[PDB]
Symmetry: C2
Subunit: 79 residues, 2 copies
């Protein structure tokens, strides 16, 4: 059922997300948006070096409790 995963950002922040192992990567991206403001289209999630696709689930990638995803923004922050 429920599980707790962690998403690490670039500035080093760690986001505690409460998900379901049958949640889509896009659902995870939407929760990340809710807690960060980054729209899901601008998010890239990496798990053990591999990029995750929005249409798959965490169970497809064997992501379990306390596992860590890495978040990287698609577009470069303006300056």
């Amino acid at each position: 059922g429920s599980m707790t995963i962690y998403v690490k950002t670039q500035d080093g922040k760690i986001i505690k997300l409460e998900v379901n192992d049958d949640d889509t990567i896009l659902n995870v991206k939407k929760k990340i948006e809710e807690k960060t403001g980054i729209p899901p289209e601008d998010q890239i999630l990496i798990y053990k070096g591999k990029v995750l696709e929005d249409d798959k689930t965490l169970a497809d990638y064997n992501i379990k409790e306390n596992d860590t995803l890495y978040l990287v923004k698609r577009l470069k922050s303006p300056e």
Copy 2:
């Protein structure tokens, strides 16, 4: 001179010959030459940190046989 490796998302590995004072943009341009991915669509990560186009490999302490990670900015259609 230096030899580095760039690992992509599909698991493929590209052996690149670079110079430690080559800019990250030069590295991205060589990646383009060997893959066709335009430099604007490339993100290079080294040990979890995204690399900036205006800095060099020596600026990021990248040495021989080190491994960078390439991720495409836009999702490839399928």
